[PDB]
Design a protein around this ligand. Structure first.
Ligand SMILES: Nc1ncnc2c1ncn2[C@@H]1O[C@H](COP(=O)(O)OP(=O)(O)O)[C@@H](O)[C@H]1O
Ligand SMILES: Nc1ncnc2c1ncn2[C@@H]1O[C@H](COP(=O)(O)OP(=O)(O)O)[C@@H](O)[C@H]1O
Ligand SMILES: Nc1ncnc2c1ncn2[C@@H]1O[C@H](COP(=O)(O)OP(=O)(O)O)[C@@H](O)[C@H]1O
Ligand SMILES: Nc1ncnc2c1ncn2[C@@H]1O[C@H](COP(=O)(O)OP(=O)(O)O)[C@@H](O)[C@H]1O
Ligand SMILES: Nc1ncnc2c1ncn2[C@@H]1O[C@H](COP(=O)(O)OP(=O)(O)O)[C@@H](O)[C@H]1O
Ligand SMILES: Nc1ncnc2c1ncn2[C@@H]1O[C@H](COP(=O)(O)OP(=O)(O)O)[C@@H](O)[C@H]1O
Ligand SMILES: [Mg+2]
Ligand SMILES: [Mg+2]
Ligand SMILES: [Mg+2]
Ligand SMILES: [Mg+2]
Ligand SMILES: [Mg+2]
Ligand SMILES: [Mg+2]
Lengths: 150, 150, 150, 150, 150, 150
């Protein structure tokens, strides 16, 4: 359905490099609707929860400390296949390997400084959206441009 | 040669979503010469003729209603490899699968609302071009930036 | 109601400089709806009546000849104060004196090559509109983004 | 000082027209730092408080009901003379009168649908920032690009 | 005539803030022909010579340190009314007072960090051009888009 | 460390088509720092050694003559994987086969007029860099946005 949501986050580097506007603008242009938005400096528990799957990985520590090293603008976009689409718009883990046209392909160079993060699955999305947003911070009844869906 | 032409059309949704100029500019920048251009509200006939290959397809009815539910800015661009290039610049049938950087990859989400249509071959182009444009509506004197061709 | 319409034309230089999509995009972004659009090579007769008010001025001859030199994409945008707004967005007759942000202020240098033309009054909008477009080439059913008007 | 803040808000129309990204991007580009950000549907009391100065004005009722008619993304930018600068970037109350280059000059047409709102004074800014944001939702220790200030 | 030249310089902050291409593109679009271009870290002399008119001014010392604290991409654009046009496109000394659409109006906040510098007169231009460029670093064969001049 | 450098050149067609700022902006946006930059009219000798590897190929003659036809803005960008990344951002030798989002995929059509040139390896980067730039024309002190690298 056209009510599928995803969690996206302009990481501390993207925020610091002033990419928030550019990133939100790209998602709005593709037609996805913003249903949650806020700037915050992630807490250590939020970062370790958000990235729980890499808790065993070696970069985990440097990932968590970085994600909490500055303000992040967490957001949730809604729309048909948004989880997979948003990812496509993001690129690949390594911005060098990311194709021009994609967010990381256009703005990134380092894997640890890859501007933005997004859910990799609908299941990861629903969980992460609940980690970073309270139900009341999320739009309930949505209305995208009627020229977006059949 | 560089006299090749393709037919392109900003669908009612692309027009309504304010993407007409966005689309024309992308072809102008690539170096294709706009040889014909007009805004029309397609008739059922033109649309059914245009999409005659999908006439037995389940989506035909909804498409023919869509394409004729409002304005369409039909255009013809000329240049070397234009038909295949234009398509590459458009993306894929499903906008969601279309890569960032391509028109549908940047602006679409629904297959029925895929912003733009273009010829899939020189044979298709020649028939669609003659389908939407009268000879007098297409330039004879075409000359692109001299820095475009060797 | 705000169904006011203005006539605009990307002159041969603007068309040749590949700024058609750019100009159209600026008016689409503003909120104006395209109710007419076409590319033609203006006839000395249309050019002459178009600029009938300058028929006595010394630049007339070179002007009529310029506008008729090549393709022009004529268009009519409808909207609340579109005549005066479109002009503001154009700049001044002298591209150099046109402020940055305006079409001529961003893309022009010479007065004879000022990229775009537009009606200076509703009186002239209606006159020039009726000059370049047949009623059947213009939209009856005009519907802009509902977030544009109160 | 370079720690001056202002309250800005992409109104329901700007949000609905997908201008959030574009607006935030303009402020980030001028060099102002984001110190507060969130999407919410203003409450009636928030709107009437925010616009308390027009409570006696005739448009007040339609202004309040509109501002609360949809989600708004309230934000606070910090920087040297940001209150006056942000306004300059906004334009004038009437988007038609707003110069090209400014937010309303580029995107608006109606006074009731003027895309964005911002503080008109440092004193109005500090109050409004407190109406829409809790101290904990605002960045305390700020760090803009060091190439921004002397 | 259209052989006039002005000297422009993306200051260390503009360079560091990643605005070099942004600036060059704006002059290319306006129709000015880049006649010389290089990236250099200005010497105290070049800078003190360059800003000799402010040598007794309180801000001279801090300016001469700034302008020489990193790379500067000095350039010379040629074209009709270029010196006055370039300045118009730049804005005013104080970026905060510079209107949206102009370079400083869009990207600056501090007077000491005003992104770009340009000649204020043909006499100033001719001296600054000869100050930063050797004759062999400037084109002799200049030819702009033929759609630029009558 | 990520001080890898590549040589890039907006060819005579790219320069003539006014795409210098656009190209530079795309690399500045990515995070690469310009450690060298100049506009010159390549000499047959430099052009010939530059393309020494194609000295036997049949297109050589017209190539050497083209690159030397007019101004070229040579540049060297430094950064993590800049050689391979810059290439990815360029597209493929054939502009038409170059994907949208890439420089050639967005602006080119002919193989002889492919807007931009760039090193295909660190070996060639270092060779071509030493070919077009004197050590004193290149930066020693390179400092990119600290949010770029870990
Ligand atoms: N070895 C690495 N070095 C540093 N950080 C890494 C590495 N691999 C993963 N990361 C970071 O952790 C984030 C989470 O990892 P992962 O979920 O695999 O990436 P993503 O979902 O963004 O593609 C990555 O986006 C990247 O910033
Ligand atoms: N399964 C479908 N459901 C809905 N509309 C579709 C479907 N497949 C194609 N379309 C519509 O019909 C138009 C014509 O179909 P087709 O020629 O297959 O697409 P294209 O050539 O644009 O990739 C489409 O681009 C789209 O608007
Ligand atoms: N003295 C001039 N020299 C050449 N062309 C001129 C001159 N003044 C006006 N023009 C041209 O004639 C067009 C029509 O005249 P006018 O209505 O005064 O211009 P506009 O309405 O576009 O400002 C101008 O936009 C410009 O191309
Ligand atoms: N008469 C009007 N009609 C409708 N709404 C109005 C009118 N004048 C003011 N407004 C709205 O109320 C907002 C608040 O008014 P005001 O504070 O004067 O404007 P601003 O501060 O945005 O310039 C205006 O931006 C505009 O949206
Ligand atoms: N009061 C000031 N304080 C700091 N720097 C200033 C001051 N006024 C001018 N500048 C700096 O010195 C440069 C040269 O001054 P000036 O020629 O007056 O400016 P411009 O011609 O760029 O408007 C400035 O643009 C700016 O970097
Ligand atoms: N067969 C061809 N015809 C004309 N020019 C060619 C051809 N193949 C390569 N070129 C030109 O020579 C340049 C140098 O050759 P090559 O190194 O293969 O290209 P690149 O590295 O840019 O992909 C090309 O970018 C293109 O302008
Ligand atoms: Mg992940
Ligand atoms: Mg088809
Ligand atoms: Mg007139
Ligand atoms: Mg107010
Ligand atoms: Mg000065
Ligand atoms: Mg090569």
């Amino acid at each position: 359905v056209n009510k599928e949501r995803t969690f996206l986050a302009v990481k501390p580097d993207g925020v610091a490099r002033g990419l928030v506007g550019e990133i939100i603008a790209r998602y709005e242009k593709k037609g996805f609707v913003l249903v949650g938005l806020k700037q915050l400096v992630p807490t250590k528990d939020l970062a370790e929860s958000h990235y729980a799957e890499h808790k065993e990985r070696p970069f985990f520590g440097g990932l968590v400390s970085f994600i909490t090293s500055g303000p992040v603008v967490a957001m949730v976009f809604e729309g048909k296949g948004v989880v997979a689409s948003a990812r496509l718009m993001i690129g690949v883990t390594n911005p060098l390997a990311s194709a021009p046209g994609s967010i990381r392909g256009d703005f990134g160079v380092d894997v640890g400084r890859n501007i933005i993060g997004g859910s990799d699955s609908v299941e990861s999305a629903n969980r992460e959206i609940a980690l970073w947003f309270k139900p009341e911070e999320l739009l309930t009844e949505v209305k995208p441009n009627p020229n977006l869906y059949e």
